[PDB]
Amino acid sequence: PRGSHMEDFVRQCFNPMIVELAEKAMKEYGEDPKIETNKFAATCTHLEVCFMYSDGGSKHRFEIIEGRDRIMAWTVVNSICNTTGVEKPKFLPDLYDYKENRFIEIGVTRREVHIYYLEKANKIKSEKTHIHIFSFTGEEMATKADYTLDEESRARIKTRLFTIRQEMASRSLWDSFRQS
Numbered sequence: 719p720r721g722s723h724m725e726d727f728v729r730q731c732f733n734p735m736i737v738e739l740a741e742k743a744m745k746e747y748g749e750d751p752k753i754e755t756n757k758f759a760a761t762c763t764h765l766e767v768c769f770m771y772s773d774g775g776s777k778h779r780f781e782i783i784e785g786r787d788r789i790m791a792w793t794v795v796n797s798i799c800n801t802t803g804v805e806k807p808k809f810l811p812d813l814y815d816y817k818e819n820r821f822i823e824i825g826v827t828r829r830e831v832h833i834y835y836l837e838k839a840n841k842i843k844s845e846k847t848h849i850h851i852f853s854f855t856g857e858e859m860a861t862k863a864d865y866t867l868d869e870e871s872r873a874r875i876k877t878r879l880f881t882i883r884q885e886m887a888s889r890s891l892w893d894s895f896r897q898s
């Protein structure tokens with residue numbers, strides 16, 4: 719195959735359960751983790767960030783949409799919309815907040831945080847879908863300046879993102895990863 723250094727780093731940087739879910743998500747979209755290795759790394763990163771995020775709240779706060787099968791992911795969205803009356807989002811969100819009663823779109827970008835959110839806001843164009851963006855530089859940006867979780871839970875996410883960046887840069891892999 720294509721013995722890429724990025725593929726072997728991804729498999730040692732993320733735990734096997736995350737790597738397996740990212741592989742299933744890329745193949746479900748008809749893409750190869752062995753060839754498009756940058757999206758392989760990004761898919762694993764978005765996955766771990768979403769799971770660290772759901773771990774920050776109370777025991778029953780979040781329903782995790784990301785990481786499920788696409789058909790079942792929309793099934794839980796139906797049950798949430800049909801039991802709480804919240805409008806149906808057009809695009810698949812990542813979580814649902816049972817405390818604040820809204821869906822959450824979590825993004826991870828290598829550019830400045832207001833770039834990615836500005837694109838996500840245009841694409842979403844829903845209504846109450848909360849947007850929370852993280853950067854690889856340590857910045858974050860959320861809708862209405864409402865960051866949902868307290869500072870500690872968001873801080874350890876920022877620390878992990880910068881650790882992944884350092885490990886990539888130490889392997890001469892950060893430059894190509896940033897240009898995508």
Ligand SMILES: [Mn+2]
Binds near residue numbers: 783784785811812813
């Ligand atoms: Mn998602």
Ligand SMILES: [Mn+2]
Binds near residue numbers: 764812825
């Ligand atoms: Mn997202």
